[model samples]
Target: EKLGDICFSLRYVPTAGKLTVVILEAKNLKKMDVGGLSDPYVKIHLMQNGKRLKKKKTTIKKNTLNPYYNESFSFEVPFEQIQKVQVVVTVLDYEKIGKNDAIGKVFVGYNSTGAELRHWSDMLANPRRPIAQWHTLQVEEEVDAMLAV
Candidate 1:
């Protein structure tokens, strides 16, 4: 809560047999350090069976309150097991020194919100048709939804 947002689009590519997510941009991010704008990057975590199966990260954007990212990533998926997929998009205040700060995150599969479930369903039903949404950020302690089994 109370942070810049990440806008993204998701769709299932049946031909490629994969789920793709495109991160559009982040706006009005929190300043990370020294009373200046922060550098940030988004991390996409794909989980299966309570374990991470794949992860992808975007390049860090320089000091600014807004960043437009060309971060498009995907995960291989089977038609039958589409319901088993769990996605977590974590936006971090990245750095070369010390540990990065976990700014905000959103999860869009299993035990989440109708927003996520709806987005996923649209992707599944329409296959290859982009389903776009704007999501506000939240801390981990703020995200309590369980994952799908």
Candidate 2:
């Protein structure tokens, strides 16, 4: 049987000379029998100001359980004209014994020119509230303790 749909978020940040596109995979993805699916691939499309900027594909190494699927892809924006961007990940074709799920838009986002990309990276690293709350404990203890040792 085919797994449920997956959703993701695309981040776009425009700086002085360049723009960066970051792809964040969906969380809590329904677990599927990897052995039953065909070669699954992810494609990202960069849209700026309602126009297409670039397209990129992600390499699905393998599927795992527990944490679900979290994949990412990044691309550089030329001309620095990006206003908003959206990413669409398609399952493509599955393996011989697997099935090909329908293709659809999985991620979309809008950002201003002054938006910062580092914040996104930091969020990924530190998360928020509850998650970050625990991260601080680790950072203050394990991280520093290791250095002191």
Which candidate's TM-score is highest? Answer: 1
Model 2 RMSD in angstroms: 14.5
The stretch of ten residues in a row with the least summed lDDT in candidate 1 is 140-149
lDDT of candidate model 2 versus the reference = 0.37
Candidate with maximal lDDT: 1
Cα lDDT over the full model 1: 0.79
Q: Write the per-residue lDDT of candidate 2 for residues 1-149, one digit (tens) a residue.
A: 22334434433333432333333333333344444533445556655444556777655534432122355465664323333343333433334453544322333234311222333343334322111100001112322222231
Error of 2 at 127 (Å): 16
lDDT of 1 by residue, 94-122 (tens): 77878998777888875567677777777
| Backbone clash pairs in model 1 (N, Cα, C under 3 Å; residues 3+ apart or in different chains), count | 0
- In candidate 2, stretches whose alpha carbon ends up further than 4 angstroms from where it belongs are 1-13, 16-35, 48-52, 61-72, 78-80, 91-93, 96-100, 110-149
Deviation (Å) of 110 in candidate 1: 1.7
- The per-prediction CA RMSD against the true structure, in angstroms, equals 2.1, 14.5
What stretches of model 1 exceed 4 Å from their correct place?
144-149
